[PDB]
Amino acid sequence: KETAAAAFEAQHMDSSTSAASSSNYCNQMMKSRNLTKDRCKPVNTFVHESLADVQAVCSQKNVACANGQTNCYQSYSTMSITDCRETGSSKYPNCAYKTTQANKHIIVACEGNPYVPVHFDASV
Numbered sequence: 731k732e733t734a735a736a737a738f739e740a741q742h743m744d745s746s747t748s749a750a751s752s753s754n755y756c757n758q759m760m761k762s763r764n765l766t767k768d769r770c771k772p773v774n775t776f777v778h779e780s781l782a783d784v785q786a787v788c789s790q791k792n793v794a795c796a797n798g799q800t801n802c803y804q805s806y807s808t809m810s811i812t813d814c815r816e817t818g819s820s821k822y823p824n825c826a827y828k829t830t831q832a833n834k835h836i837i838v839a840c841e842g843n844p845y846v847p848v849h850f851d852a853s854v
């Protein structure tokens with residue numbers, strides 16, 4: 731019942747911090763955002779930039795999405811991000827993640843009017 735656009739913001743936006751605090755950042759955020767409520771979501775990326783800068787990517791470099799579609803865009807410059815990936819020992823409901831902070835380019839799929847990001851394809 732929540733729009734695709736709204737769903738992108740809730741899963742991937744984190745403008746409150748400039749970067750991952752500690753090795754426990756992922757464990758905390760995946761819970762806070764309700765991502766481990768019914769199962770352990772396996773993979774998720776959080777972006778530490780302003781909403782305006784992330785939305786502007788839909789006007790940058792056009793590339794192909796992993797599924798063959800052509801509505802994906804790559805950011806001109808690198809951004810501060812945090813990758814979260816579930817560990818091998820992890821079993822619902824005791825969800826655990828590995829936290830990896832870095833500076834990379836992001837790739838998102840865009841749609842609508844206005845044309846904003848609706849999916850997170852990958853980081854480069």
Ligand SMILES: O=c1ccn([C@@H]2O[C@H](CO)[C@@H](OP(=O)(O)O)[C@H]2O)c(=O)[nH]1
Nearest residue numbers: 738741773774775848849850851852853
């Ligand atoms: O680098 C990646 C790859 C996938 N995902 C996540 O994994 C899902 C696909 O399996 C993506 O769905 P969504 O685009 O609809 O949000 C995204 O949430 C990330 O967060 N980062």
